[PDB]
């Protein structure tokens, strides 16, 4: 029977083939060394720079980070593809980690020649409809690719960390164990996010997955490198996710859902939402501005606070009913999902 | 490290981006007022504020027997200033059989950007399609794939299977249910429709009600608040079942409710004997003169007759070709799949 | 309607190829298995998955038995029904071959491509004819190469193509095509360990189909000689830092392999792991991983004497062993 | 190591041992012949009388009955334990079946010597707390036993038939595939019910199972023997289960939940229950008496109707709100659960 | 065939039958008024109409922050004429930590048959027990087994684990939740309590709150509407976890919330190091003078102190025996298991 | 409080026997396997399920290795902790033996009964010591005899006792006692095919424990000779109307059994079933079912020559065959 040889590719698939090939080198495989395999976690990472710094999800080395390691502790095995086409194995020493953003940084001792840093794009200028490519190196002997479009922006990631991440990219490229921790790339091969594994509420797939946007990666990684951690200042309250807030007709601001016992929030004058014995619902305060740096949703509020330091005193502009009130509060050090 | 700014888009992703942005305005958000923390998307049908969605997105409200005029939804519509504005959605009419509902919003015609509607009958498997949603009233969603199949049963979360549906490999989910499926020219070719499968298992394809159906049902709901259908109360085999039984042309009669018009007319159903030797229920190949290829077509053909009408059914009863006559009556029975 | 370039090309490729994609109903199943197949040649040979006629195959049919009803789309747009008589089947590769008695005019054999030159990122079309009344299409890219397929036959197939086109009952047994419309694999239904979908599916590569199908036509089955040992799948091996060769995991009591002097992999109580031999050469022919070793031994026959070059820890040893028929197929236990 | 021999048993366990042994002979095994086994339905039945009549659940030969068999058709393989201690295999020809009560009768051609009829007790005089023994012969090579107490009376059985059976016995003896179709016996060895397999709403076991009471078996079996079937007359409406009715504060009568299109019920003047757009609930009529044979719950109503014949005209005494109204209706021939 | 009439009952089944019938009257039915088609059984506590049940059977009503006096339940009580009569159940008080709630019914003392309460502290594994329910207000249910275990954690469907519970192999289910567990003399030894397990899997045993707890909590709810507890906000290891870590005496401190009284007092928690070498958090062996066997006992001991009180904790820190002093404050934190 | 007769007897039987029921924690498991065991004798031998120390056993411990921590209830009401050193293990019967170094005064060996004289309907007590701080009890009746146990080791054990006393992690590895407080089996955790509970549990009969435990003490393991064939479980066989003997289902290629001339069971395509040979005699010793055949062959050794009397259809044939070590344990695949 006649076998037709590989012929020229069409323009679009041709470009994807080239983008994938070129970026394979920048996508590493990571094995969590604390896992005794079945001899009868883990995933991908991205080469951050020529120094040997590696970026991955907190979760891909979750089990290891659950053992309270200090910087320098060998926490991963890293496989890096060389020009020779073969993957070389390196010690991944822990640099820093941040569970809230499901990001972890490792450092490798490797020849700069061997290391090919990912190109970084701007996630803030992404448009729904843009092509994206999710690359993985899940086992350190090959690479994987899924392709789809930016499906939504500024969506919550229900990370398998257990903590939900605000401001996530949604894509209809398949995101799975084969690419978790690896890069989401745009049509130019620029990193626009980190493929992030999630848990859904139900068992059924909605056919879409998620990436931590590069804007967040750029903000977090250097902090992890310098300080091994991100110290955050904020308010220990529970705010409504955009979907809940909007369903309750809160179109603007951060709706306060809960304000726990004797909290700083309590003492400053902030009210939660509830149901009365009638079945009536009683809306909580809505934070519209910090000082008066405008707030329009939960996620942006978090990003406002994440930059102040502990003890900073600020002025919350709030909405309760139709009124508009200013409130003082001091910030202290800064939760999960049911998935 | 160094940050590279938004580059120029390639042609295909470029078109998709512009089609999406252009169509955000026509894709509204609907919250069922009877729910607390259904719900999903809809489509601006015309400049008068008529809104089209799935029966299922306002299913809870519809179950409580509301009357036309009742506020059953809160409708969010994207204005040119980029913020979504809120409107009461009054019920116009609903049709469970086709999983469609129509609401009416009181808004400035200057606000409303009616969706552009195309012809689903000309669709080709392989064509690009975009499924758009506005599931929470604060942004929009997109998925993209191809037309994967045509004339397929939709196991709607209504509990009632819809025939003649479009299959796509664009992800169809709660984030775009009730929203439009568009072709590459941005014409509406269907309404994204949530389904239940028999298993807990994704086949990786989704479904939409074809625009040809929407075009037929919506004006009736607007004019009458409901769809009156003439038909025959019998159970017909789904196409995959009929073909498995080697019935390659016509609609196969499976079950015939006791003392029905069908029974009195002498229509025979389908029975697996204790040995195992199948007599095939009658097979309907023609209504009067016009040929019937399958179940979907029989339904489509009948839907154009009136409740008074007496028709002649040309049927295959085993080997022989025979004729039975029957009066059509209001087609009330619903086709319940029992997927969950 | 008028169409844009890429979608225009898919629409035409799909239409052109519908004729070569048949529908198969397993005749041993009563209504309320089953799927698609491909026309292999003008004599009426039809290729499909073992699994799409699995029920019939479980009943030990002989070649010539009517195991399926086959529907084939004719030039006039209607599908015609034919008796599908069994030609041969191979559970190990989840492939089966039927023969229909039909006119050449009806039969449009699929064109076959070269799966060994595939590149991740290439467009693929997965086509089905699930019910004999229409055809289905899903479109994605090649997502991965040389991946294990956990076939619904219950047996793991090495060397599979991974794609992010949806592979489902609507196209199982059907062709996976490249952008030239050349067959690059056969869409193959799988069971996952969990059930949670990863958004990717699998196809047996056409190189395997090319190897197996003529043997089924001639002999009705494929006989294999090998070694009764358990080899490490690639992920597990590369977790243990074995980047080359077939890592030997388990080694049976009193086996040919034992007699030959080949070591299994052992976790000692003192928490440690010690590595089984790694097979890197069969008759000095380089062995790259498990799938490669399997491919290589499949070319021998029962009784043949071969020389294995193994890596025992940091050593280099050459063993003798005689190949025998194997005690099992490789059963994953996914459901 | 020293091994102590079987010694005398204590009184209670001694009696159970004896009851079990003695009744094994009366408990048969039934294989549904339409099932091709895995060569690389079904359960137990009870010997009804010396004629060879066998009583089991509809469900244990469910697959066979799904093929529309006529009386006389060989529908089961029956294994009967003989004094010799060995089970002998017989043809089970279908006598009759009733899906609504999940009962089926088979007839065997066997030596009267071989057949040991079960002793039948009165289920109507059962008391919660009484000891019960559930016996099975699931495979025709041994027998099984579970022991518990009557846990509740007049409870719905959500049979694996798909149809719920009113008036069932609840027991905390384990009811399972090992005894489905077999007898539930009281402390004297008298048959008080037929162990009946069910589907639960949720997946969690409540630790209790069910038996069709002997009162029902006694009423149904002879009809199946004479007529191969039970013809029933009734009203094609949907009535509320006791638990729902009581929760809505209907303590007496049969609460009408649904009255479908153009039904006899429609035309006679019967109303269903519903929720209004408010979320308000609107109670349907409550049938308190047929003619004036008092009704106090769904189950007793069914048992009133099951004795009239088709076309009989009766007078429903109903409650709507506070009033009390009489209603005429003619009965026609006579539904499932979501489990 | 021939029908044999009700024979005489044997002694054990005979006793069970009479105990059950006798106790039906004390076992009421409770419907949460905030639910539509929670709910279960309760126990008549005294002749004044005080009703005892699980917090969980009226959980939905309690979540809406009702005040004492609010009608949160419909209570059905079996009278001597054999019919259940209906009463408004007004909330008296609830305690989530012990999964107990008290309602108040306005009824003729002649109607009310208070349950007889026994001593759970004298219970022996192997004793016969009966679990009675009145789940729908039209009859009663019974299950029977033995006391299977003592002082076991109850993973209450409240979401909060209760220490010191009774384990039985009588089936405990929605049909008897909130109802009494009785001994062979018909004394109340516990309240049947619905649980969540970690798996979807029955171990075939159920749980009840011991009467010793009920005896302590109920009068407080009647007098005060709530229970005030003095304690220490720290996380203590469940007994099965402590023993697995070879801590065979005392309460093992797992976690110590940042800048708590416990922290400032110098109590050390438990940490698994990156190598793997466990330093055991402090182990509390005595409060002041009185010895502490395990976690349940520490809680029990603390519950008798007052919010003012300063106590001396004798602790095991690795090998050495040490003392840390701490003021008790209101024990607010709840112990959430996360089973579903 | 004062107690009624039957409950009084249980309470006392339970208390008296707590001392003989120990707690075992598998030392290879880090906290947040494990269960109960029985004191076998005054030298400190402890019997439990293979599965309760399964993790440790997976790591290939040698006899003498500390595989468990054992807690034993002393006369003063507190449990004392001891190193549990491995003596022997047998996965096939889900049994393991440990040895503790303790004073005779501490050790109260369980009294052993006769499982072969058990009657359905008898009272049984299932006792546990799951955590080393108390004991648990469940009470039921003997519900069935000679039933397959689908052990959580993954291997099916024939000849098991079925009871409607709850068997759970709280008593796995612990004793099942009769009304005299005699050991009649070891409570054994199982996996069911579905997961849906049938309200009954299982115990390895003391006759099996009696047979296995001394061999583990002497030799650390049990070696078995048998036939590499697949035998029909009793339900399946009695569905096919085989009421006596071991029905042979599967028969490997080039097996000793094949060479011997023994037929498998076959479903022909023409819808029919044809019966594999039924083994009814090993050296003219009557074979009643699968479990009996297994018991019988376990008494031989590798190499022994035996005569099988089979029933081939309506025939009567006598074959020769040599017994070999077996290629597998019998794995159900329940989870």
Author numbering:
A (entry chain B), D (entry chain B): 104 to 143, 153 to 446, 450 to 454
B (entry chain A), E (entry chain A): 104 to 140, 153 to 455
C (entry chain C), F (entry chain C): 110 to 141, 153 to 455
Paper's wording?
The crystallized Deg8 (S292A) contains 358 amino-acid residues (Leu91–Ser448), of which residues 104–448 could be defined in the electron-density map. The catalytic triad of Deg8 consists of His171, Asp214 and Ser292. Deg8 contains one PDZ domain that shows a different orientation compared with that in the Deg1 hexamer. As such, the Deg8 PDZ domain is flattened out from the trimeric core made by the protease domain and the concavity of the trimeric funnel is shallower than in Deg1. The Deg8 (S292A) hexamer has a narrower cavity and a distorted His171 like His147 in Deg5. Six pairs of hydrogen bonds are observed between Arg179 and Phe389* from opposite trimers, stabilizing the hexamer. Trimerization is primarily mediated by hydrophobic interactions and hydrogen bonds. The recombinant Deg8 exhibits a remarkably lower proteolytic activity than that of Deg1 in degrading substrate. This incompetent state suggests that to activate Deg8 a new activation mechanism may be employed for rearrangement of the activation domain.
